[PDB]
Amino acid sequence: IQRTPKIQVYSRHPAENGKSNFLNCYVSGFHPSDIEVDLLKNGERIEKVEHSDLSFSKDWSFYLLYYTEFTPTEKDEYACRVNHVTLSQPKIVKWDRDM
Amino acid sequence: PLSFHVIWIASFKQNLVSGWLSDLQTHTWDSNSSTIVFLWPWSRGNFSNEEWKELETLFRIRTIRSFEGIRRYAHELQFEYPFEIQVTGGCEGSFLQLAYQGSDFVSFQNNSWLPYPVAGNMAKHFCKVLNQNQHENDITHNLLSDTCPRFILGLLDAGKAHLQRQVKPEAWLSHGPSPGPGHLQLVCHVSGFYPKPVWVMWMRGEQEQQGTQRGDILPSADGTWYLRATLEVAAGEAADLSCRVKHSSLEGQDIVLYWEGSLVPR
Ligand SMILES: CCCCCCCC/C=C\CCCCCCCC(=O)OC[C@@H](O)COP(=O)(O)OCC[N+](C)(C)C
């Protein structure tokens, strides 16, 4: 039984341009645990991204938090890109903010 | 629900062992060091340096035996590559459960491993392998019934400081991305709060707006929580709306934000 990941993107603090913040991508509810997750800035992969230790829920599905420190600008768009055996193509979820 | 548990994730290669106080990770096992990493000062609980040495050796031989144990018995039990084994065990009452390929497979009850009935004879034959040495099953029982209760008591004591802290939320408002035609999606973000229980509603004055859709509570790396609450409304009806947040850390003084300014706009 394969389970596709839920993908949620959020910032630690309100977006304020030129102010340091944290970008989060919480990926959950997936099986098997083999997964590839990237944080994207303007469609380009962000180099220094940390993640939590792999864990799983009561229903045995896995979950991970990916995050990175960042400073937003007016110009920049951020997203989370996920690939998993359940996905015929990498799934991309944008960070929605008001600009 | 006050509980401690250990989890094992093995993929066939990858072997991860970690300890948890509910959502909160407290321990990690490093195999090459063959040591138990304590993630917090108080992760050691009321257990002494020498007793932790004892636990490490048990964790030593048990993990490597089991990892390599699975690694060897695969063909017999019809385990096809790739496959994953997950187990979790701990106490609150105790428990120890094993999944294969993300499904309930076997569990440890009293003194032996029992197959989940819906898991077929494949599970039953795994139980025969797991129930070879009765003494080793007896060690497992004592780990769960004796050691784990003792441990969790000390851990909660030593961790009471960190565990019972109050961290105030911060909140903000934005436009949601997917409103239906003629409508807006108002979103109220709440972050930085601990502990977890929280209350958030869109309001018209003192009237709670029952259209308020609260998302999952999500983690942050600093150990605090995050939540978004959205409200869909007709665009000509978004005046005088506010988002109200209540939390134990605020002691009665709710955060209240108003849909206004450039949000409206004007
Ligand atoms: C290193 C991170 C964890 C540190 C924990 C320190 C505190 C210890 C506290 C309480 C005692 C442990 C309670 C749970 C133990 C359950 C019994 C038990 O054997 O649990 C062991 C597992 O959890 C860890 O790995 P495995 O031994 O590979 O999994 C089971 C092996 N198999 C053959 C059945 C598949």
GROMACS .gro file of C-alpha atoms and ligand atoms in nm:
model
  400
    1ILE     CA    1   0.000   0.000   0.000
    2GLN     CA    2   0.158   0.323  -0.127
    3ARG     CA    3   0.064   0.662   0.017
    4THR     CA    4   0.125   0.995  -0.155
    5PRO     CA    5   0.273   1.284   0.047
    6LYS     CA    6   0.077   1.580   0.177
    7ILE     CA    7   0.289   1.895   0.125
    8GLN     CA    8   0.240   2.218   0.325
    9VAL     CA    9   0.452   2.536   0.295
   10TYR     CA   10   0.471   2.812   0.552
   11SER     CA   11   0.696   3.077   0.701
   12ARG     CA   12   0.796   3.105   1.068
   13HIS     CA   13   0.719   3.479   1.082
   14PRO     CA   14   0.511   3.717   0.868
   15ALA     CA   15   0.685   3.800   0.541
   16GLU     CA   16   0.868   4.129   0.563
   17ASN     CA   17   1.106   4.216   0.282
   18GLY     CA   18   1.471   4.234   0.380
   19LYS     CA   19   1.405   4.060   0.711
   20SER     CA   20   1.551   3.721   0.804
   21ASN     CA   21   1.286   3.441   0.837
   22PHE     CA   22   1.247   3.060   0.809
   23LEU     CA   23   1.080   2.879   0.521
   24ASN     CA   24   0.918   2.543   0.605
   25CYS     CA   25   0.799   2.248   0.398
   26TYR     CA   26   0.618   1.984   0.599
   27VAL     CA   27   0.583   1.662   0.404
   28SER     CA   28   0.365   1.394   0.563
   29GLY     CA   29   0.138   1.092   0.524
   30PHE     CA   30   0.364   0.911   0.275
   31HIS     CA   31   0.483   0.551   0.228
   32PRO     CA   32   0.748   0.418   0.142
   33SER     CA   33   0.994   0.657   0.316
   34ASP     CA   34   1.216   0.704   0.012
   35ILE     CA   35   1.153   1.068  -0.080
   36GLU     CA   36   1.324   1.366  -0.240
   37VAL     CA   37   1.244   1.718  -0.122
   38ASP     CA   38   1.390   2.051  -0.243
   39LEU     CA   39   1.324   2.410  -0.141
   40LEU     CA   40   1.322   2.633  -0.447
   41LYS     CA   41   1.405   3.001  -0.485
   42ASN     CA   42   1.295   3.145  -0.817
   43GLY     CA   43   1.276   2.791  -0.952
   44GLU     CA   44   1.635   2.724  -0.841
   45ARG     CA   45   1.731   2.470  -0.574
   46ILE     CA   46   1.833   2.622  -0.237
   47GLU     CA   47   2.164   2.477  -0.127
   48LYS     CA   48   2.147   2.476   0.252
   49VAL     CA   49   1.831   2.307   0.366
   50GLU     CA   50   1.798   2.117   0.694
   51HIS     CA   51   1.548   1.846   0.783
   52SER     CA   52   1.416   1.669   1.094
   53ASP     CA   53   1.492   1.302   1.166
   54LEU     CA   54   1.260   1.070   0.974
   55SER     CA   55   0.961   0.963   1.185
   56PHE     CA   56   0.616   0.814   1.137
   57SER     CA   57   0.258   0.855   1.261
   58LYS     CA   58   0.026   0.605   1.430
   59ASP     CA   59  -0.094   0.484   1.088
   60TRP     CA   60   0.273   0.410   0.998
   61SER     CA   61   0.290   0.682   0.730
   62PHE     CA   62   0.616   0.887   0.738
   63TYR     CA   63   0.661   1.261   0.788
   64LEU     CA   64   0.953   1.506   0.767
   65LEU     CA   65   1.007   1.881   0.816
   66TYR     CA   66   1.238   2.063   0.571
   67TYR     CA   67   1.346   2.419   0.647
   68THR     CA   68   1.597   2.693   0.572
   69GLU     CA   69   1.677   3.040   0.697
   70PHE     CA   70   1.608   3.302   0.427
   71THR     CA   71   1.551   3.671   0.363
   72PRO     CA   72   1.262   3.746   0.125
   73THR     CA   73   1.278   4.023  -0.138
   74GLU     CA   74   0.992   4.167  -0.351
   75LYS     CA   75   1.129   3.980  -0.654
   76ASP     CA   76   1.163   3.629  -0.511
   77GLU     CA   77   0.920   3.338  -0.523
   78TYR     CA   78   0.973   3.032  -0.304
   79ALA     CA   79   0.835   2.680  -0.331
   80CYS     CA   80   0.874   2.323  -0.216
   81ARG     CA   81   0.936   2.049  -0.478
   82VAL     CA   82   0.865   1.685  -0.391
   83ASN     CA   83   0.929   1.358  -0.575
   84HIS     CA   84   0.804   1.019  -0.455
   85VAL     CA   85   0.721   0.683  -0.616
   86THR     CA   86   0.350   0.774  -0.592
   87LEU     CA   87   0.405   1.081  -0.816
   88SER     CA   88   0.416   1.063  -1.197
   89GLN     CA   89   0.598   1.397  -1.174
   90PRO     CA   90   0.758   1.621  -0.909
   91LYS     CA   91   0.486   1.804  -0.721
   92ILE     CA   92   0.545   2.172  -0.653
   93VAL     CA   93   0.384   2.375  -0.377
   94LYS     CA   94   0.439   2.753  -0.363
   95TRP     CA   95   0.487   2.968  -0.057
   96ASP     CA   96   0.180   3.199  -0.078
   97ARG     CA   97   0.247   3.544   0.058
   98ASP     CA   98   0.094   3.885  -0.010
   99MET     CA   99   0.325   4.110  -0.213
  100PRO     CA  100  -0.160   1.115   2.692
  101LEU     CA  101   0.176   1.105   2.875
  102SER     CA  102   0.396   0.850   2.697
  103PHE     CA  103   0.750   0.766   2.588
  104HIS     CA  104   0.837   0.542   2.296
  105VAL     CA  105   1.120   0.417   2.077
  106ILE     CA  106   1.090   0.376   1.702
  107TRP     CA  107   1.289   0.168   1.456
  108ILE     CA  108   1.284   0.229   1.083
  109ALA     CA  109   1.466  -0.027   0.871
  110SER     CA  110   1.468  -0.022   0.490
  111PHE     CA  111   1.602  -0.297   0.263
  112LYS     CA  112   2.069  -0.040   0.408
  113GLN     CA  113   1.895   0.223   0.625
  114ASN     CA  114   1.852   0.168   1.000
  115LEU     CA  115   1.715   0.447   1.221
  116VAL     CA  116   1.647   0.427   1.596
  117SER     CA  117   1.509   0.723   1.789
  118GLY     CA  118   1.330   0.803   2.114
  119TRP     CA  119   1.025   1.027   2.153
  120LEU     CA  120   0.819   1.204   2.410
  121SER     CA  121   0.505   1.222   2.194
  122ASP     CA  122   0.584   1.476   1.920
  123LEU     CA  123   0.914   1.560   2.091
  124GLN     CA  124   1.228   1.368   1.993
  125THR     CA  125   1.456   1.313   2.294
  126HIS     CA  126   1.709   1.054   2.176
  127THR     CA  127   1.892   0.939   1.864
  128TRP     CA  128   2.099   0.628   1.802
  129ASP     CA  129   2.424   0.661   1.614
  130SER     CA  130   2.523   0.314   1.487
  131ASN     CA  131   2.885   0.386   1.389
  132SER     CA  132   2.944   0.548   1.728
  133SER     CA  133   2.718   0.270   1.856
  134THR     CA  134   2.602   0.526   2.110
  135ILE     CA  135   2.282   0.687   2.231
  136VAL     CA  136   2.284   1.058   2.153
  137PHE     CA  137   2.096   1.267   2.410
  138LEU     CA  138   1.917   1.553   2.237
  139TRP     CA  139   1.853   1.745   2.558
  140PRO     CA  140   2.049   1.773   2.885
  141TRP     CA  141   1.749   1.623   3.065
  142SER     CA  142   1.724   1.340   2.807
  143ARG     CA  143   1.938   1.136   3.047
  144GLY     CA  144   1.643   1.138   3.290
  145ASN     CA  145   1.717   1.040   3.651
  146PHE     CA  146   1.939   0.761   3.515
  147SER     CA  147   2.310   0.758   3.602
  148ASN     CA  148   2.604   0.763   3.363
  149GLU     CA  149   2.678   0.394   3.428
  150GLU     CA  150   2.319   0.276   3.381
  151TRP     CA  151   2.317   0.453   3.044
  152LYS     CA  152   2.626   0.256   2.956
  153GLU     CA  153   2.421  -0.058   3.024
  154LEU     CA  154   2.133   0.053   2.801
  155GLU     CA  155   2.371   0.133   2.514
  156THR     CA  156   2.510  -0.221   2.513
  157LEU     CA  157   2.158  -0.365   2.508
  158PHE     CA  158   2.067  -0.126   2.228
  159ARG     CA  159   2.395  -0.230   2.065
  160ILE     CA  160   2.345  -0.603   2.032
  161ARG     CA  161   1.967  -0.580   1.993
  162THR     CA  162   1.955  -0.340   1.695
  163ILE     CA  163   2.236  -0.506   1.506
  164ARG     CA  164   2.097  -0.854   1.572
  165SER     CA  165   1.754  -0.751   1.456
  166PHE     CA  166   1.866  -0.550   1.151
  167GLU     CA  167   2.093  -0.834   1.034
  168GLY     CA  168   1.826  -1.076   1.157
  169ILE     CA  169   1.568  -0.940   0.913
  170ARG     CA  170   1.845  -0.912   0.653
  171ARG     CA  171   1.893  -1.287   0.672
  172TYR     CA  172   1.541  -1.427   0.712
  173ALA     CA  173   1.388  -1.244   0.410
  174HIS     CA  174   1.360  -1.529   0.154
  175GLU     CA  175   1.197  -1.759   0.410
  176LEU     CA  176   0.925  -1.511   0.503
  177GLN     CA  177   0.862  -1.418   0.137
  178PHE     CA  178   0.995  -1.065   0.197
  179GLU     CA  179   1.045  -0.906  -0.143
  180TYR     CA  180   1.289  -0.620  -0.200
  181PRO     CA  181   1.240  -0.335  -0.152
  182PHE     CA  182   1.061  -0.349   0.182
  183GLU     CA  183   1.044  -0.152   0.505
  184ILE     CA  184   1.004  -0.264   0.864
  185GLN     CA  185   0.882  -0.021   1.125
  186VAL     CA  186   0.843  -0.085   1.492
  187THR     CA  187   0.738   0.133   1.784
  188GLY     CA  188   0.740   0.045   2.151
  189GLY     CA  189   0.704   0.220   2.482
  190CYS     CA  190   0.463   0.294   2.762
  191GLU     CA  191   0.198   0.534   2.896
  192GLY     CA  192   0.036   0.044   3.013
  193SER     CA  193   0.287  -0.068   2.749
  194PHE     CA  194   0.306  -0.157   2.380
  195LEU     CA  195   0.534  -0.287   2.105
  196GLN     CA  196   0.424  -0.312   1.745
  197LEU     CA  197   0.581  -0.402   1.414
  198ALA     CA  198   0.469  -0.310   1.062
  199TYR     CA  199   0.574  -0.454   0.724
  200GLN     CA  200   0.528  -0.238   0.412
  201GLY     CA  201   0.336   0.017   0.619
  202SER     CA  202   0.074  -0.226   0.755
  203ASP     CA  203   0.011  -0.385   1.097
  204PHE     CA  204   0.204  -0.713   1.095
  205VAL     CA  205   0.293  -0.843   1.441
  206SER     CA  206   0.282  -0.718   1.799
  207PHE     CA  207   0.426  -0.816   2.136
  208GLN     CA  208   0.163  -0.912   2.393
  209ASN     CA  209   0.257  -1.022   2.745
  210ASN     CA  210   0.554  -1.250   2.676
  211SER     CA  211   0.554  -1.333   2.304
  212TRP     CA  212   0.498  -1.203   1.952
  213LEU     CA  213   0.149  -1.248   1.812
  214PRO     CA  214   0.050  -1.209   1.447
  215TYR     CA  215  -0.225  -0.963   1.349
  216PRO     CA  216  -0.495  -1.192   1.207
  217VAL     CA  217  -0.543  -0.990   0.886
  218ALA     CA  218  -0.170  -1.032   0.827
  219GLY     CA  219  -0.167  -1.387   0.694
  220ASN     CA  220   0.048  -1.690   0.765
  221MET     CA  221   0.345  -1.475   0.662
  222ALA     CA  222   0.305  -1.295   0.996
  223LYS     CA  223   0.255  -1.624   1.182
  224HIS     CA  224   0.582  -1.763   1.050
  225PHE     CA  225   0.760  -1.440   1.143
  226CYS     CA  226   0.627  -1.495   1.495
  227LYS     CA  227   0.786  -1.841   1.504
  228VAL     CA  228   1.124  -1.686   1.424
  229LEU     CA  229   1.062  -1.404   1.677
  230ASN     CA  230   0.953  -1.651   1.946
  231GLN     CA  231   1.253  -1.881   1.929
  232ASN     CA  232   1.439  -1.767   2.238
  233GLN     CA  233   1.183  -1.733   2.515
  234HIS     CA  234   1.443  -1.570   2.740
  235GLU     CA  235   1.496  -1.290   2.490
  236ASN     CA  236   1.118  -1.241   2.482
  237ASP     CA  237   1.132  -1.220   2.860
  238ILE     CA  238   1.393  -0.948   2.836
  239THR     CA  239   1.159  -0.762   2.599
  240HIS     CA  240   0.870  -0.788   2.845
  241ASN     CA  241   1.081  -0.642   3.126
  242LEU     CA  242   1.201  -0.357   2.905
  243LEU     CA  243   0.841  -0.253   2.848
  244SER     CA  244   0.688  -0.333   3.187
  245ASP     CA  245   0.980  -0.236   3.413
  246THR     CA  246   1.248  -0.021   3.245
  247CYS     CA  247   1.019   0.203   3.038
  248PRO     CA  248   0.789   0.305   3.328
  249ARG     CA  249   1.093   0.384   3.544
  250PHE     CA  250   1.253   0.580   3.262
  251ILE     CA  251   0.953   0.794   3.171
  252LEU     CA  252   0.910   0.905   3.533
  253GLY     CA  253   1.265   1.041   3.558
  254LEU     CA  254   1.250   1.190   3.209
  255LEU     CA  255   0.933   1.389   3.282
  256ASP     CA  256   1.079   1.512   3.609
  257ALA     CA  257   1.410   1.620   3.454
  258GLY     CA  258   1.229   1.770   3.155
  259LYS     CA  259   0.949   1.942   3.350
  260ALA     CA  260   1.120   2.279   3.295
  261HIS     CA  261   1.125   2.263   2.916
  262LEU     CA  262   0.801   2.065   2.898
  263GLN     CA  263   0.586   2.311   3.092
  264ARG     CA  264   0.709   2.637   2.935
  265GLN     CA  265   0.466   2.887   2.780
  266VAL     CA  266   0.562   3.051   2.449
  267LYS     CA  267   0.330   3.326   2.321
  268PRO     CA  268   0.198   3.306   1.962
  269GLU     CA  269   0.239   3.574   1.700
  270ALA     CA  270  -0.024   3.608   1.426
  271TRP     CA  271  -0.078   3.776   1.092
  272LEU     CA  272  -0.329   3.811   0.812
  273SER     CA  273  -0.300   3.750   0.435
  274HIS     CA  274  -0.501   3.675   0.119
  275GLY     CA  275  -0.563   3.309   0.045
  276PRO     CA  276  -0.478   3.176  -0.301
  277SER     CA  277  -0.788   2.990  -0.420
  278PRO     CA  278  -1.109   3.188  -0.366
  279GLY     CA  279  -1.421   3.110  -0.574
  280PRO     CA  280  -1.554   3.381  -0.810
  281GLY     CA  281  -1.693   3.688  -0.633
  282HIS     CA  282  -1.524   3.569  -0.314
  283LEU     CA  283  -1.213   3.622  -0.104
  284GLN     CA  284  -1.018   3.385   0.113
  285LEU     CA  285  -0.901   3.546   0.437
  286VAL     CA  286  -0.622   3.367   0.614
  287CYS     CA  287  -0.510   3.408   0.970
  288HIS     CA  288  -0.164   3.261   1.048
  289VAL     CA  289  -0.067   3.171   1.406
  290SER     CA  290   0.297   3.077   1.480
  291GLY     CA  291   0.555   3.046   1.756
  292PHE     CA  292   0.322   2.903   2.020
  293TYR     CA  293   0.385   2.626   2.275
  294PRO     CA  294   0.233   2.415   2.412
  295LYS     CA  295   0.010   2.281   2.134
  296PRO     CA  296  -0.357   2.346   2.232
  297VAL     CA  297  -0.475   2.666   2.070
  298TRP     CA  298  -0.796   2.844   1.971
  299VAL     CA  299  -0.836   3.056   1.659
  300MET     CA  300  -1.150   3.197   1.492
  301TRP     CA  301  -1.253   3.454   1.238
  302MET     CA  302  -1.509   3.687   1.405
  303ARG     CA  303  -1.766   3.953   1.325
  304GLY     CA  304  -1.745   4.139   1.659
  305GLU     CA  305  -1.829   3.883   1.931
  306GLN     CA  306  -1.989   3.647   1.674
  307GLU     CA  307  -1.770   3.349   1.582
  308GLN     CA  308  -1.775   3.292   1.204
  309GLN     CA  309  -1.850   2.921   1.168
  310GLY     CA  310  -1.702   2.914   0.816
  311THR     CA  311  -1.359   2.925   0.983
  312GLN     CA  312  -1.153   2.637   0.844
  313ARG     CA  313  -0.859   2.547   1.065
  314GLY     CA  314  -0.567   2.363   0.901
  315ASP     CA  315  -0.336   2.107   1.065
  316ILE     CA  316  -0.107   2.224   1.345
  317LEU     CA  317   0.242   2.217   1.189
  318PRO     CA  318   0.590   2.204   1.351
  319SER     CA  319   0.876   2.453   1.340
  320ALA     CA  320   1.240   2.362   1.391
  321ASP     CA  321   1.253   2.560   1.714
  322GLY     CA  322   0.992   2.327   1.868
  323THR     CA  323   0.696   2.566   1.845
  324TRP     CA  324   0.376   2.518   1.640
  325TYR     CA  325   0.201   2.680   1.345
  326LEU     CA  326  -0.158   2.690   1.226
  327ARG     CA  327  -0.356   2.865   0.955
  328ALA     CA  328  -0.731   2.939   0.974
  329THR     CA  329  -0.914   3.048   0.661
  330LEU     CA  330  -1.250   3.205   0.589
  331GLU     CA  331  -1.417   3.229   0.252
  332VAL     CA  332  -1.649   3.531   0.216
  333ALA     CA  333  -1.821   3.737  -0.052
  334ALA     CA  334  -1.593   4.030  -0.133
  335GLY     CA  335  -1.863   4.280  -0.047
  336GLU     CA  336  -1.882   4.134   0.303
  337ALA     CA  337  -1.526   4.128   0.438
  338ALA     CA  338  -1.550   4.455   0.629
  339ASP     CA  339  -1.539   4.436   1.010
  340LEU     CA  340  -1.391   4.086   1.016
  341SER     CA  341  -1.120   4.005   1.267
  342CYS     CA  342  -0.909   3.703   1.361
  343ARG     CA  343  -0.903   3.615   1.733
  344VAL     CA  344  -0.641   3.389   1.895
  345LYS     CA  345  -0.661   3.240   2.246
  346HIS     CA  346  -0.373   3.051   2.409
  347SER     CA  347  -0.265   2.941   2.757
  348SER     CA  348   0.046   3.158   2.731
  349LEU     CA  349  -0.155   3.481   2.693
  350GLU     CA  350  -0.344   3.457   3.024
  351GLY     CA  351  -0.672   3.596   2.896
  352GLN     CA  352  -0.532   3.859   2.663
  353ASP     CA  353  -0.633   3.736   2.318
  354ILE     CA  354  -0.446   3.837   2.005
  355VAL     CA  355  -0.694   4.017   1.779
  356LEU     CA  356  -0.613   4.122   1.422
  357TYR     CA  357  -0.841   4.319   1.186
  358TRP     CA  358  -0.897   4.277   0.811
  359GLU     CA  359  -0.802   4.632   0.711
  360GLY     CA  360  -0.558   4.870   0.546
  361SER     CA  361  -0.415   4.748   0.215
  362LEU     CA  362  -0.590   4.415   0.274
  363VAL     CA  363  -0.936   4.566   0.217
  364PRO     CA  364  -0.795   4.778   0.026
  365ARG     CA  365  -0.811   5.134   0.179
  366LIG     C1  366   1.871   0.535   2.092
  366LIG     C2  367   1.735   0.598   2.093
  366LIG     C3  368   1.644   0.539   2.199
  366LIG     C4  369   1.694   0.551   2.342
  366LIG     C5  370   1.598   0.492   2.446
  366LIG     C6  371   1.652   0.498   2.588
  366LIG     C7  372   1.550   0.468   2.697
  366LIG     C8  373   1.500   0.324   2.702
  366LIG     C9  374   1.362   0.319   2.761
  366LIG    C10  375   1.281   0.216   2.763
  366LIG    C11  376   1.310   0.080   2.711
  366LIG    C12  377   1.274   0.061   2.565
  366LIG    C13  378   1.126   0.044   2.538
  366LIG    C14  379   1.099  -0.009   2.398
  366LIG    C15  380   1.176  -0.136   2.367
  366LIG    C16  381   1.092  -0.242   2.299
  366LIG    C17  382   1.158  -0.379   2.291
  366LIG    C18  383   1.259  -0.390   2.180
  366LIG     O1  384   1.325  -0.487   2.156
  366LIG     O2  385   1.266  -0.275   2.112
  366LIG    C19  386   1.377  -0.256   2.023
  366LIG    C20  387   1.347  -0.154   1.916
  366LIG     O3  388   1.267  -0.047   1.968
  366LIG    C21  389   1.471  -0.097   1.852
  366LIG     O4  390   1.524  -0.184   1.749
  366LIG     P1  391   1.497  -0.338   1.713
  366LIG     O5  392   1.551  -0.423   1.828
  366LIG     O6  393   1.571  -0.372   1.590
  366LIG     O7  394   1.336  -0.368   1.696
  366LIG    C22  395   1.268  -0.492   1.730
  366LIG    C23  396   1.346  -0.610   1.679
  366LIG     N1  397   1.266  -0.718   1.608
  366LIG    C24  398   1.350  -0.841   1.587
  366LIG    C25  399   1.147  -0.753   1.692
  366LIG    C26  400   1.218  -0.669   1.475
   0.00000   0.00000   0.00000
